[PDB]
Amino acid sequence: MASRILLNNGAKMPILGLGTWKSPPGQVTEAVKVAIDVGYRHIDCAHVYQNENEVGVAIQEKLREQVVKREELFIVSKLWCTYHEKGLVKGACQKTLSDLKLDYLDLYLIHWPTGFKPGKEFFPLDESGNVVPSDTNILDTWAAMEELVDEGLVKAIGISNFNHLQVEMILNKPGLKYKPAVNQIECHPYLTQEKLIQYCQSKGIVVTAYSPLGSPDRPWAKPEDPSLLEDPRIKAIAAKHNKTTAQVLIRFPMQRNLVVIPKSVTPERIAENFKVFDFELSSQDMTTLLSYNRNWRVCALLSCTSHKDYPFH
Numbered sequence: 165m166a167s168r169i170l171l172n173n174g175a176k177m178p179i180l181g182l183g184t185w186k187s188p189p190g191q192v193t194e195a196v197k198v199a200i201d202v203g204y205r206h207i208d209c210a211h212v213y214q215n216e217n218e219v220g221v222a223i224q225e226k227l228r229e230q231v232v233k234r235e236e237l238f239i240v241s242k243l244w245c246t247y248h249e250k251g252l253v254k255g256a257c258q259k260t261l262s263d264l265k266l267d268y269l270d271l272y273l274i275h276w277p278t279g280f281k282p283g284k285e286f287f288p289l290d291e292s293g294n295v296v297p298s299d300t301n302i303l304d305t306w307a308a309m310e311e312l313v314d315e316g317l318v319k320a321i322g323i324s325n326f327n328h329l330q331v332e333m334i335l336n337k338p339g340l341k342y343k344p345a346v347n348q349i350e351c352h353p354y355l356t357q358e359k360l361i362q363y364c365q366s367k368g369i370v371v372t373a374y375s376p377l378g379s380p381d382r383p384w385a386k387p388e389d390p391s392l393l394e395d396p397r398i399k400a401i402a403a404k405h406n407k408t409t410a411q412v413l414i415r416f417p418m419q420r421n422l423v424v425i426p427k428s429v430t431p432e433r434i435a436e437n438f439k440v441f442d443f444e445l446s447s448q449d450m451t452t453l454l455s456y457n458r459n460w461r462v463c464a465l466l467s468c469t470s471h472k473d474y475p476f477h
């Protein structure tokens with residue numbers, strides 16, 4: 165399978181990237197270093213992850229060491245919810261750039277469609293526990309994203325966790341200058357996303373699948389939750405192909421023309437997860453994996469359900 169997908173900004177994006185959410189800061193520099201060494205060229209980052217400085221140390225070391233050139237890396241970050249205001253976007257981007265040690269990002273995403281009240285807290289809550297929104301119109305946040313393109317700070321802009329109607333809203337934005345290049349969404353056999361994916365694809369927006377392994381390290385895992393990695397049916401497909409369950413889980417989105425960003429800080433897994441370009445799931449496997457859909461989300465984030473732009477109703 166070809167390793168990159170063409171975006172609607174004319175640039176090519178690696179279909180496999182390394183996720184960094186929950187990667188401990190004292191481990192993520194080595195994780196990114198190992199990933200680059202084993203072939204990853206796409207790193208998925210975010211300011212809210214609190215580890216971009218340490219990601220950046222790895223990127224800069226690999227650039228300085230001559231292991232990779234900047235043009236070959238595809239570095240993604242995301243505008244956190246507390247920075248949706250147009251006057252905050254450039255500084256948020258520039259802080260990410262400064263921490264990642266970059267002069268530009270390949271892709272900068274609106275992390276969530278939900279703007280949160282600006283301030284030092286990333287997760288501002290009221291006394292009762294509800295997310296405190298900001299009044300910013302995502303179309304204005306989008307225009308601020310467009311300005312980053314026009315200032316040279318980012319090569320592409322996109323969105324994340326936008327539902328079908330939210331994507332449509334950006335696409336229908338009066339005066340839209342740049343279409344989103346990417347919509348990054350949760351996607352795996354328990355959350356197959358057929359409708360959203362087809363819509364985005366039909367519009368020339370590339371979809372990135374997050375939590376493709378079902379995020380077993382998510383902080384809110386419960387015993388009753390289904391477990392992709394432990395699902396006998398998926399294990400059986402893996403066994404049939406002589407691959408690990410994780411490898412099946414990564415290959416699945418790739419064959420749907422998605423980008424996929426499994427996270428690990430374990431060197432052996434980082435390498436395992438990249439070894440997915442050498443086998444193919446059958447049409448029957450694909451259809452069978454699709455059949456496991458149960459609309460189950462790692463990132464359900466019920467604490468945000470009353471936000472006006474909460475995307476998962």
Ligand SMILES: NC(=O)c1ccc[n+]([C@@H]2O[C@H](COP(=O)([O-])OP(=O)(O)OC[C@H]3O[C@@H](n4cnc5c(N)ncnc54)[C@H](OP(=O)(O)O)[C@@H]3O)[C@@H](O)[C@H]2O)c1
Nearest residue numbers: 183184185374375376377378379381410426427428429430
């Ligand atoms: N845009 C968004 O809103 C959003 C939300 C969620 C995620 N994301 C992005 O998507 C990335 C991936 O999602 P995720 O971090 O939620 O979870 P994930 O990639 O589905 O799963 C990560 C977990 O799987 C383990 N793991 C990795 N490879 C494995 C393998 N081969 N065998 C067994 N276990 C393995 C990891 O352990 P170790 O690390 O200990 O090896 C970690 O516990 C994130 O890191 C982030 O970059 C974005």
Ligand SMILES: COc1ccc2c(C(=S)N(C)CC(=O)O)cccc2c1C(F)(F)F
Nearest residue numbers: 185210212276278287295463465466467468
């Ligand atoms: C939009 O709302 C979000 C978004 C993300 C989170 C996360 C994060 S940082 N993730 C799920 C990872 C990610 O968004 O990439 C953790 C805890 C609560 C969140 C919330 C929450 F609202 F629940 F506070």
